[PDB]
Design an enzyme around this catalytic site. Structure first.
Site, short mmCIF file in Angstrom:
data_model
loop_
_atom_site.label_atom_id
_atom_site.label_comp_id
_atom_site.label_asym_id
_atom_site.label_seq_id
_atom_site.Cartn_x
_atom_site.Cartn_y
_atom_site.Cartn_z
N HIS C 43 44.08 29.11 31.62
CA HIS C 43 44.24 30.48 32.12
C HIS C 43 45.45 30.82 32.96
CE1 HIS C 43 42.31 29.37 35.96
NE2 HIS C 43 43.14 30.35 36.40
N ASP C 99 38.71 25.51 29.82
CA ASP C 99 39.90 25.95 30.55
C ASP C 99 40.86 24.78 30.87
OD1 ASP C 99 41.50 27.82 31.90
OD2 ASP C 99 40.34 27.80 33.68
N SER C 205 44.46 27.68 41.26
CA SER C 205 43.99 27.44 39.88
C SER C 205 44.89 26.50 39.16
CB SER C 205 43.88 28.72 39.04
OG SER C 205 43.89 29.82 39.56
C1 LIG Z 1 43.79 30.66 40.48
O1 LIG Z 1 44.48 30.53 41.46
C2 LIG Z 1 42.78 31.88 40.42
C3 LIG Z 1 41.47 31.47 41.14
C4 LIG Z 1 41.45 30.03 41.73
C5 LIG Z 1 40.44 29.81 42.82
C6 LIG Z 1 39.03 29.58 42.29
C7 LIG Z 1 37.96 29.57 43.41
N1 LIG Z 1 37.83 30.55 44.30
N2 LIG Z 1 37.06 28.60 43.48
C8 LIG Z 1 42.75 32.49 38.94
C9 LIG Z 1 41.71 33.37 38.18
C10 LIG Z 1 40.31 33.48 38.19
C11 LIG Z 1 39.67 34.21 37.15
C12 LIG Z 1 38.17 34.47 37.04
C13 LIG Z 1 37.55 34.46 35.78
C14 LIG Z 1 36.19 34.70 35.60
C15 LIG Z 1 35.40 34.94 36.70
O2 LIG Z 1 34.06 35.14 36.51
C16 LIG Z 1 35.98 34.97 37.96
C17 LIG Z 1 37.35 34.73 38.13
C18 LIG Z 1 40.44 34.78 36.13
C19 LIG Z 1 41.80 34.67 36.13
C20 LIG Z 1 42.41 34.01 37.17
C21 LIG Z 1 43.90 33.93 37.31
C22 LIG Z 1 44.13 33.09 38.56
O3 LIG Z 1 45.09 32.09 38.21
#
Ligand SMILES: *C(=O)[C@H](CCCCC(=N)N)[C@H]1c2cc(-c3ccc(O)cc3)ccc2C[C@@H]1O
EC number: 3.4.21.5
Lengths: 36, 10, 259
Positions: C43, C99, C205
């Site tokens: 992603h 992913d 991520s």
């Molecule tokens: C990467 O940096 C983020 C999130 C990373 C931290 C994860 C955490 N808090 N444990 C990325 C991200 C997250 C999603 C997403 C998809 C589906 C969901 O139900 C919730 C969140 C989508 C796209 C991204 C891009 C970003 O790189």
């Protein structure tokens, strides 16, 4: 050989290779049913 | 925000 | 990373920064798995809902780093990508299942005190260590508070951050969310009642969840930072790509080309 090249994976030059521990890795090993 | 990187890497 | 701390120098010499060329910015974390292969989350490259679709030439990989923003002159190395490989069944339409992506570097990096690959787990290592309550470690340069929904404070680190997080039981992972959880995912984080906290956050991520084996004292990458709802929200968890379950595909791509 070993995998791609290493073989030496996962052993850090500044820590495991010199028998030094980082400052929180004990927290990890203590969680692995501590051990002994 | 980033410090500039050397042009040979672009 | 939320609620972690500054890494020691050389504590995580497989950590890679995924950096775009223009505008110059941090995209994601990643990891070094041999002299020419990098592991990340798919992603980070390809996410159609958000019009994200990076190719090789859009990107640099930076290895050997500690500081987020400095050009670390005789320490980091910058590399170019020869080829990106995303898993053919990465499910971006639904739940970010599978992913995972591999990146082939244009030329091998040399290892140093600051640059060294992590190991990937074998079956018995995964089986021993991937257990609820066992802690692993996540590292990254991503945000320090949820701007993944606009939080402030400190914001962004100057140096690589680190946090140690326990793996959570599958039932409790699935009962925290409405997203359908697959066998290619695990979750991790503290429960609301535990008193410790901490999480990955935006910009984290793609990087490594690692554990140290007590049998041979080596570090293994067990997860890739994949998704979460918010950062460090109570009763929510971080989800990670299950690296061992996708290891066949990893071996496939690194075997088929392949020198
Ligand atoms: C990467 O940096 C983020 C999130 C990373 C931290 C994860 C955490 N808090 N444990 C990325 C991200 C997250 C999603 C997403 C998809 C589906 C969901 O139900 C919730 C969140 C989508 C796209 C991204 C891009 C970003 O790189």
């Amino acid at each position: 050989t070993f995998g791609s090249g290493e073989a030496d994976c996962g052993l850090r030059p500044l820590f495991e290779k010199k028998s030094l521990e980082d400052k929180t890795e004990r927290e990890l090993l203590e969680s692995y049913i501590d051990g002994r | 925000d980033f410090e500039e990187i050397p042009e040979e890497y672009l | 990373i939320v609620e972690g701390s500054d890494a020691e120098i050389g504590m995580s010499p497989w950590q890679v920064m995924l950096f775009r060329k223009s505008p110059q910015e941090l995209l994601c974390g990643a990891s070094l798995i041999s002299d020419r292969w990098v592991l990340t989350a798919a992603h980070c490259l390809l996410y159609p809902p958000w019009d994200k679709n990076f190719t090789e030439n859009d990107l640099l990989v930076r290895i050997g780093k500690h500081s987020r923003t400095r050009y670390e002159r005789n320490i980091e190395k910058i590399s170019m990508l020869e080829k990106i490989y995303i898993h053919p069944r990465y499910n971006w339409r639904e739940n970010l299942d599978r992913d995972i992506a591999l990146m082939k570097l244009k030329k091998p990096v040399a290892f140093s005190d600051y640059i060294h690959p992590v190991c990937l787990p074998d079956r018995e290592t995964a089986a021993s260590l991937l257990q609820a309550g066992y802690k692993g470690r996540v590292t990254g340069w991503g945000n320090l508070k949820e701007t993944w929904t606009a939080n402030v404070g400190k914001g962004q680190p100057s140096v690589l951050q680190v946090v140690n997080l326990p793996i959570v039981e599958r039932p409790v992972c699935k009962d925290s969310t409405r997203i359908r959880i697959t066998d290619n995912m695990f979750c991790a984080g503290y429960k609301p009642d535990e008193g410790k906290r901490g999480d990955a956050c935006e910009g984290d991520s793609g990087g490594p969840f690692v554990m140290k084996s007590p049998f041979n004292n080596r570090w293994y990458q067990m997860g890739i930072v994949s998704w979460g709802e918010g950062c460090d929200r109570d009763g929510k968890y971080g989800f990670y790509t299950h690296v061992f379950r996708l290891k066949k595909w990893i071996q496939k791509v690194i075997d088929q080309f392949g020198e």
